[PDB]
Amino acid sequence: MGKVLLVISTDTNIISSVQERAKHNYPGREIRTATSSQDIRDIIKSMKDNGKPLVVFVNGASQNDVNEFQNEAKKEGVSYDVLKSTDPEELTQRVREFLKTAGSLEHHHHHH
Numbered sequence: 001m002g003k004v005l006l007v008i009s010t011d012t013n014i015i016s017s018v019q020e021r022a023k024h025n026y027p028g029r030e031i032r033t034a035t036s037s038q039d040i041r042d043i044i045k046s047m048k049d050n051g052k053p054l055v056v057f058v059n060g061a062s063q064n065d066v067n068e069f070q071n072e073a074k075k076e077g078v079s080y081d082v083l084k085s086t087d088p089e090e091l092t093q094r095v096r097e098f099l100k101t102a103g104s105l106e107h108h109h110h111h112h
Contacts, residue, residue: 002051005098009086018091037068053102081111
């Protein structure tokens with residue numbers, strides 16, 4: 001059991017860019033990248049194995065896969081946050097803000 005940031009964008013050029021920046025600036029972090037519901041479920045299962053601060057960059061995944069993410073998480077009780085932004089600066093700072101509140105802050109971040 002843990003917590004995850006669902007980074008959603010239609011701009012895969014922005015997603016991949018920030019995803020690089022996030023993995024190379026934070027190399028000791030488990031970061032994820034989903035195409036469809038296959039990956040989505042593999043990710044929530046990765047949280048079942050122990051549970052780490054995951055950041056799921058969905059490479060322009062359908063609203064169907066977004067719905068699958070929400071459903072598969074909440075039915076199990078998995079804590080998740082959802083983000084819809086195509087701004088590179090937004091997504092970059094959302095990674096570190098997420099890791100900081102998921103690692104050690106006072107407010108237990110729990111969007112749903």
